[PDB]
Design a protein around this ligand. Structure first.
Ligand code: HEM
Length: 154
């Protein structure tokens, strides 16, 4: 797939708002993912034990990881499709060490779109949400193609 420059602009225009508070967005997004799809929390051996949303909000580790994830995602979006080098080490650790199924990457994509919609309504209208969805589908499609080359699948 290929986004047009106008679609990338819509993605980078709402992303520049997220980057005013990376840690807060990371927290929101992971908590939304863990509430919606609690099975995903099991992949994290460091947080796995958190029982409630208050415990999650209070976990410094969870917040740090959210920052990790969003910074890596932001660097991929900024490439505007030319992200091959960034995806390699990412597809290798998620397919071989962590073992994150594409299904989960869809679940977090949904969590990202939910939070942007809540926090940025004026910059996340329908066309911008479509473009963000297209940029995350692109990301999942390229990662899934690397997963296959690396031997991971199902
Ligand atoms: C937008 C999607 C994602 C991005 C860009 C991303 C990025 C990262 C980054 C950069 C790291 C640290 C470097 C490395 O281990 O590769 C990481 C580690 C990790 N990621 Fe992902 N990730 C994403 C989605 C997920 C999802 C959906 C899950 C789980 C349901 C997950 C589980 C983890 C785990 C278990 C680790 C290691 C945590 C720890 O340090 O122990 N990732 N991810």
């Amino acid at each position: 797939m290929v986004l047009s420059e106008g679609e990338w602009q819509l993605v980078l225009h709402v992303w520049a708002k997220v980057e005013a508070d990376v840690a807060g967005h990371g927290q929101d997004i992971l908590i939304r993912l863990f509430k919606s799809h609690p099975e995903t929390l099991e992949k994290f051996d460091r947080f796995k034990h958190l029982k409630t949303e208050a415990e999650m909000k209070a976990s410094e580790d969870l917040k740090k990881h959210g920052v990790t994830i969003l910074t890596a995602l932001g660097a991929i979006l900024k490439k505007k499709g030319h992200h091959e080098a960034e995806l390699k080490p990412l597809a290798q650790s998620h397919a071989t060490k962590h073992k994150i199924p594409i299904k989960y990457l869809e679940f977090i994509s949904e969590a990202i779109i939910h939070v942007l919609h809540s926090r940025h309504p004026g910059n996340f209208g329908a066309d911008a949400q479509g473009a963000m969805n297209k940029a995350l589908e692109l990301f999942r499609k390229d990662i899934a193609a690397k997963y296959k080359e690396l031997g991971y699948q199902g």
